[PDB]
Subunit: 264 residues, 5 copies
Amino acid sequence: LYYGLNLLIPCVLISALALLVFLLPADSGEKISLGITVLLSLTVFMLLVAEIMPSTSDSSPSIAQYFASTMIIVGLSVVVTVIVLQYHHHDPDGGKMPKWTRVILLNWCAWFLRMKRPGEDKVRPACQHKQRRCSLASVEMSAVAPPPASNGNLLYIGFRGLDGVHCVPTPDSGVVCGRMACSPTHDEHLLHGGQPPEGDPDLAKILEEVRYIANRFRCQDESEAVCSEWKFAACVVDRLCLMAFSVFTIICTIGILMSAPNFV
Amino acid sequence: LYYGLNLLIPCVLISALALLVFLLPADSGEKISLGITVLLSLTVFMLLVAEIMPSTSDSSPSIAQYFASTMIIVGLSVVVTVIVLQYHHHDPDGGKMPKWTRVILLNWCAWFLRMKRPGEDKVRPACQHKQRRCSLASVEMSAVAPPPASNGNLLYIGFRGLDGVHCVPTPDSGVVCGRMACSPTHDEHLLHGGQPPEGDPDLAKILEEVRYIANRFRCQDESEAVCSEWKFAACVVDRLCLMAFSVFTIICTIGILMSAPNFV
Amino acid sequence: LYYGLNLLIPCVLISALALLVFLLPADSGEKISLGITVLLSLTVFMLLVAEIMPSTSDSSPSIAQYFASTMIIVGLSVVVTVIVLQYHHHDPDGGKMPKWTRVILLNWCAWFLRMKRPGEDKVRPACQHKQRRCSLASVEMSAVAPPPASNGNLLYIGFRGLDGVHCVPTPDSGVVCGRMACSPTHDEHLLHGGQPPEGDPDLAKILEEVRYIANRFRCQDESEAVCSEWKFAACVVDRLCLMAFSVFTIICTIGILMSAPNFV
Amino acid sequence: LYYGLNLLIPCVLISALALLVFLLPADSGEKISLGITVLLSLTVFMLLVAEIMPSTSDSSPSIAQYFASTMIIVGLSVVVTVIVLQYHHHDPDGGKMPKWTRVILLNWCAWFLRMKRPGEDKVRPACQHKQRRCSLASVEMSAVAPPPASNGNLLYIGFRGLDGVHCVPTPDSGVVCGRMACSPTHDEHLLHGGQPPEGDPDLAKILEEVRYIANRFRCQDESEAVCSEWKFAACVVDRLCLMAFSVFTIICTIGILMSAPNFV
Amino acid sequence: LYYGLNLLIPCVLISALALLVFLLPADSGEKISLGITVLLSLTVFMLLVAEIMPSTSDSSPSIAQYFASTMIIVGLSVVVTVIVLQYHHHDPDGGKMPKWTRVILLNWCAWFLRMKRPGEDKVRPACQHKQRRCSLASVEMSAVAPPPASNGNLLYIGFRGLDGVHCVPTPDSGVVCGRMACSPTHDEHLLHGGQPPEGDPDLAKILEEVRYIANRFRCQDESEAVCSEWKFAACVVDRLCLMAFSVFTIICTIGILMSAPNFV
């Protein structure tokens, strides 16, 4: 009665912790260590195995096969932890070349947020009207800008979209000579009470330095955004590995349960 | 004499450390590891158990049941540690969907600060006057703004409450044409000593860039505030788990004490 | 000859490391783990004890009592480590209510810097003149401001002391109409070369935003100062616990030494 | 059947983790610990060896030689981990004197990005035209500035290249007296509507302080860049050590496989 | 053949790692733990010793003395690690009073950079001319300012040297009334085109707030500089301890080698 419980509780707990390690968010600070830490908890347990199946007295290959399979599984998990952490730095050494895994990471992120399976993708409010049709705004295979949206598309084309209307307004809109809203129509005599349009050119340099420091801060902001994106990609890969290993763990448990009468 | 002490001191110390781990604040840096670290301290101790109850010589299911229960308890604690840490990042992968646990976290935070049990909620200075009544300022089921307070309500409606009087003063107050306090009454001839009301439009752009960098800093401030809120939620969940497991640990100790004569 | 040395060196080293852990500064990042790490170093050592005093072959309660006492001491130390770390975050959950331990922490900090024992408090340069007397500047039981000093009192009453002379100069000093030092005496005709006293009101808004960002930075400065104060309080509590446990460790060592002939 | 598997799976897993540790990016926070952590996982395993080859009962030098070789390999790896981490701080104590390893690190970084082996260096689009020739812009043995490029050469000569045309425009270009583009040709009567060219000298001091704080921020930016360069150098050295130890591990595995029939 | 190798390789590896731990830079984050981590690697190894020299079967004081010496050495190293880390925070509790170890740390830093031994101090380019003589600029026993240099002396006397010529130019230089270089000679009629010398006093307040935030940033810069100095001092003390323990380790190895025939 105590043998089965003492052999099942620790193994089941270790198998559950192995999955919980990946279920944890992308904590690059501790993950790389946590994945190994759990492994240590198994090594000590291996000693107890020597009591029930010594390496020179008892010959029980049945449970030894399952133990070796679990050891290989945890080793592969610890190894893939390093590959996952690799996506957090992207050192210049190379390896995981960019422009290849980004399309897969974006697809995974879109499938996690917007479910794709028939349970929620097909069974949902839909119609055959223009609300689900496609046009020049959807089919952008020719490198067309995205539609105007507040999720990072309206201000994107403006700020990040260099050479656009916000920075290069070459299209003749007629505001410089047709409208007077904050734009005098070819008014060359508009003087600031007898002075030029600018009180002191030093203000221009002050504004330039202010914009320079603002861009310096935006550089760190973009670095933090890239770090967050790398963390999200690592978490997505961890979730994928968890989903993949879930089936293997379930199969191993089913085999150990169905093969228990053969040994016990 | 030495057997009972040697079997009680380590188990009691481990049971106390298991609770102290949750009693620790929400230290995401070490908590995720600490919860596992303590577990290691038990694994080695398990070896000592093999001396008193070998897995193939002695059959003592009485204490084995309690040992397995303690192992399952610590495993569940380590597993819930990961669920708690999950509330610290809220990755885009999903899982703990927001807008559901926030109402429970706020309720727990309000109950911890403002006690709700009869010991302090009912036995306190109270009266049947307007000080405890309700009005349009308390019953805000129609999405009404909170009362004016300095705890994050007076400046909230002003700054975060867009489209309000601070940004969209559409209500005709009469200050633009009835009062002269920092608001000339339709005075179109008010010139800055012969110059327009503004010395140089470049100052407007300088102020705009200053406000832009101020908003950039406020973004990081809000990120830090959200991180602190997530840490507080994790600490609240840890305290809840501690309170829940306290009864289980007390019951286990009472059972081990009352069942000691059966084994010893 | 080897038995006594092998039993004394590890125990003495562990007892010294237990105290050195608290002697370490308030390193919240590693302390919480360090206190537990040392504990692990003892668990393995316990295995060696099983060789000299098996749990079912040898009955030696003499040294077993001291071993259990040391185990309880290290467990209490590890437990108090969590209480110490609790003073580093002060989560909204409650527990260590403020306004109670602050007066004790300040007293401990003043006693550590300014020694209070007769060895250095009484034996020091002193006299019965006004240098050691008290007046309205020392007896501030009526919530009086502290004396003017550069240790955080001169600028404190100025900046942090709202409603004072620096922000609300209600006392009629006579500088607005009696002195002309940076204060024209009721000079309403003082114009900036024909212009108002201010060139552009936009400069006022620029200065206001500059002061706003300065206050935003001062907020983080105050947060860091509070964190440093919490770290100092944790270090003070650690030093107090070290001083308390020093006597217990000395008594345990004296007992083990005087009781050695009984066992050895 | 179980003996060979139980002796091969753990050893192979440890050998793979030893290489994966170096395959991990330059994580100075955990690397220094990770390299040692894996070592611990071997120590416990050594205990199991005592079951198959006790230190006083069985004499099997064949596998003992391979075990000692693996132990020495992991020890050398752990030792070189410290030398790698040394490149992350470069303390004033000395040791790894600069100006010597920089030329090797740059060469390694250029070889990793731009492959040098014949597989990709020689087999690639090339021609005997000027596209592959050399001139005064390529042969810069006389300390000549690099060609103008956007990879850190166009703005480098401008900002970091003190005493240049951007800061010391001594070459007579003729813009001060030949061109009027933002440079009045010796126009001494150009007044800002009756005022000097500058409205207020205080703006000059404001711009000077703005540039001072910008340089203060650039100092931290350069510190972060140097830290990133040190991390990249550490990662390059780790990859080099990995490539070096790969051949040794392969040779050890081949020897253990070919020498298995002698022992088994 | 296997006994000697199995007893020498682990001990030698541990002795080398003990020194490599100190050879590592002053990593306060991991050092405090690393020093203890290595210790754990020894505890497990101690178990193996019980196989060759049980605590109740074999009496071998020869190697037991060396084992106890190594244990005491590693314990003293771990203890001194805490004293080294103490120099990283300098808590208000006291202990290592400043103004005493600073002169020793500076001397050690100067001896490490500028070698003092005859191998490099005496054997170097030197002469008996004024290049090696002393004058009022070298003998500064009367608290004289250091010579003008770019290593932190030219700008030091200017910025940090309050009450100097940069802030208190009391010496009558004659520039206020003798030179017109950015200093009108008692020109009271110099008006900014009919306006006072300053366009708007608000610019003075803006510059004052800019300087205030610059000083706030300089405060954090000085804090980081002090932290770096403390880290350098800790690294210097670690190197000193390494050099001290090198002789002890060499003596222990020589003794173990010369005393091997007595035991083996």
